[PDB]
């Protein structure tokens, strides 16, 4: 849509409705030439084809799109090809499992200017596009998401891959091995200490979850390259939320900037409360 | 008893199972872990106590190391995992939320055997080599099916081995193991009948060559001189889509090509159809009307 991480954000969200458990991310040199997401989700029926083009109407005016299908309640699957209008150029029978394959060719081909930055800053925007990718691996239990790459005429690579695991520590692991679990400790959470609420309660509805670094000397990280913060399972940047864990992390080791992966669970406001809550837990931690 | 078998194993357990994605952890070449996962059919609670070039596959991989189990079949609520201990007997089983499919964990091949152990890591170059070169084969054949592996040494980041991408073709998938640059020096086989030389050079008359059940495709390297490769590394035969050695067949193929390009080997990949109550070392019935076919077809392929 915006960005190749954008873009890669809206497919697998789209997987992730599907109610799939394998979400592939298939990318030659990096996404400039194509980004593809198969699932094996419910899949598309037939009466739906055209309602497919909002994301998928945009992807289709800025590259080349197309989509292989199955419904569970089909007897095969159909491939569809769009073009920039999101008309269906062609469908033809498929024979494919059950799921979608949404494949973005050339992305940005449409707009040369946004095509040429893509280029020069692929390097950057992949790095975007990993993160984005990192968060959904962890955050996504129960689900294993997995990317190649491709770069030139050289062989498929595997990037990453979950092995569709219940907890967020395994796909922790999976993502970055083993080695970075041994300096994580788990969340724990407190109610808010009279000093902390000073600072800034009874009807608290935050439940947070994860994972941080210890504050041991030497055992934090040089930047705050891995630093995941999600609000209802879903990948996003709260600024004040991370700032205050920052801060929290640097009153016990100032040199270094903690791996972070936390979830906030809230009912469907109060952030002084969430703040409190989060300072209050993090100095029980790491006391 | 070899690294190369008990990949082989649990790779075909997952197409067995009738997986679409099958992923290979691999920790020291396998030494410390060997783990396929796979989202194929998983295996049922009743069936858990029976679970335990052959390496049962199941059974002696638990004498051999510390196997543990998850899986989660589609008439199953919720999924399990399973240890085992060296018997084949159930330690504990837990229930585990887990996608439909089977992940099977090997972690330390052959430390019951101390002398076998030591063997293995020794020979961990061959034996890695020699599996690589299996998982290669089932990465060609497997159509459709998104094969990846990766190797951990030590604690260090994990290391590309080869992923297939879920293409249809063949072809597609000799581009994801070796790049497109193998694919620009290869040309596909384009079978014929047996000529008449070939056939009588081989004692086979017109009503021997009648009955040709024999449907062999593939690709193999152009005779260009320079374009083929130093040696028969990159060599796979199939018969009905199985990995196999045929020697008769494999000296007969690196024969043709030696005849346009003697100081080269092919890359060779080639798969034999033919039906099942034929296929007997491989003991394929009217083996002469096959080499007859392959040697004709290759010479008007290299001419
Ligand atoms: N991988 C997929 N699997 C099954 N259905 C899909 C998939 N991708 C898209 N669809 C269907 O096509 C519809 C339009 O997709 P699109 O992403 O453009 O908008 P949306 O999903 O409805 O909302 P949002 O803007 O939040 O993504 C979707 O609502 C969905 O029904
Ligand atoms: N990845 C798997 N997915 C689903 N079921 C499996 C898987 N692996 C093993 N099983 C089940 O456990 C049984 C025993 O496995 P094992 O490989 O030891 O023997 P086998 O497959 O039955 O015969 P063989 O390996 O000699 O062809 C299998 O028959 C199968 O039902
Ligand atoms: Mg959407
Ligand atoms: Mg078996």
Do not use: W
């Given at each position: 849509?915006?960005?190749?991480?954008?873009?890669?954000?809206?497919?697998?969200?789209?997987?992730?409705?599907?109610?799939?458990?394998?979400?592939?991310?298939?990318?030659?040199?990096?996404?400039?030439?194509?980004?593809?997401?198969?699932?094996?989700?419910?899949?598309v029926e037939?009466e739906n084809?055209?309602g497919?083009?909002?994301?998928?109407?945009?992807?289709?005016?800025?590259?080349?799109?197309?989509?292989?299908?199955?419904?569970?309640?089909?007897?095969?699957?159909?491939?569809?090809?769009?073009?920039?209008?999101?008309?269906?150029?062609?469908?033809?029978?498929?024979?494919?499992?059950?799921?979608?394959?949404?494949?973005?060719?050339?992305?940005?081909?449409?707009?040369?200017?946004?095509?040429?930055?893509?280029?020069?800053?692929?390097?950057?925007?992949?790095?975007?596009?990993?993160?984005?990718?990192?968060?959904?691996?962890?955050?996504?239990?129960?689900?294993?998401?997995?990317?190649?790459?491709?770069?030139?005429?050289?062989?498929?690579?595997?990037?990453?891959?979950?092995?569709?695991?219940?907890?967020?520590?395994?796909?922790?692991?999976?993502?970055?091995?083993?080695?970075?679990?041994?300096?994580?400790?788990?969340?724990?959470?407190?109610?808010?200490?009279?000093?902390?609420?000073?600072?800034?309660?009874?009807?608290?509805?935050?439940?947070?979850?994860?994972?941080?670094?210890?504050?041991?000397?030497?055992?934090?990280?040089?930047?705050?390259?891995?630093?995941?913060?999600?609000?209802?399972?879903?990948?996003?940047?709260?600024?004040?939320?991370?700032?205050?864990?920052?801060?929290?992390?640097?009153?016990?080791?100032?040199?270094?900037?903690?791996?972070?992966?936390?979830?906030?669970?809230?009912?469907?406001?109060?952030?002084?409360?969430?703040?409190?809550?989060?300072?209050?837990?993090?100095?029980?931690?790491?006391?």
């Open positions: 849509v915006l960005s190749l991480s954008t873009a890669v954000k809206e497919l697998v969200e789209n997987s992730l409705d599907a109610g799939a458990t394998n979400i592939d991310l298939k990318l030659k040199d990096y996404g400039v030439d194509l980004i593809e997401v198969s699932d094996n989700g419910c899949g037939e084809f055209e497919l083009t909002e994301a998928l109407s945009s992807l289709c005016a800025l590259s080349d799109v197309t989509i292989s299908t199955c419904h569970a309640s089909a007897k095969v699957g159909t491939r569809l090809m769009f073009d920039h209008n999101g008309k269906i150029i062609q469908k033809t029978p498929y024979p494919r499992p059950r799921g979608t394959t949404v494949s973005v060719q050339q992305l940005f081909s449409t707009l040369p200017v946004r095509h040429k930055e893509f280029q020069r800053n692929i390097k950057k925007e992949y790095a975007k596009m990993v993160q984005v990718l990192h968060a959904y691996c962890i955050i996504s239990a129960g689900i294993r998401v997995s990317c190649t790459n491709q770069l030139g005429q050289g062989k498929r690579q595997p990037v990453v891959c979950t092995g569709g695991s219940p907890s967020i520590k395994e796909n922790i692991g999976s993502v970055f091995g083993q080695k970075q679990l041994q300096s994580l400790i788990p969340f724990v959470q407190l109610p808010p200490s009279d000093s902390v609420c000073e600072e800034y309660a009874l009807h608290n509805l935050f439940y947070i979850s994860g994972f941080i670094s210890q504050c041991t000397h030497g055992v934090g990280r040089s930047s705050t390259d891995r630093q995941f913060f999600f609000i209802n399972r879903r990948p996003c940047d709260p600024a004040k939320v991370c700032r205050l864990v920052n801060e929290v992390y640097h009153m016990y080791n100032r040199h270094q900037y903690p791996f972070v992966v936390l979830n906030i669970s809230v009912d469907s406001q109060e952030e002084k409360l969430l703040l409190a809550v989060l300072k209050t837990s993090l100095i029980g931690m790491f006391d």
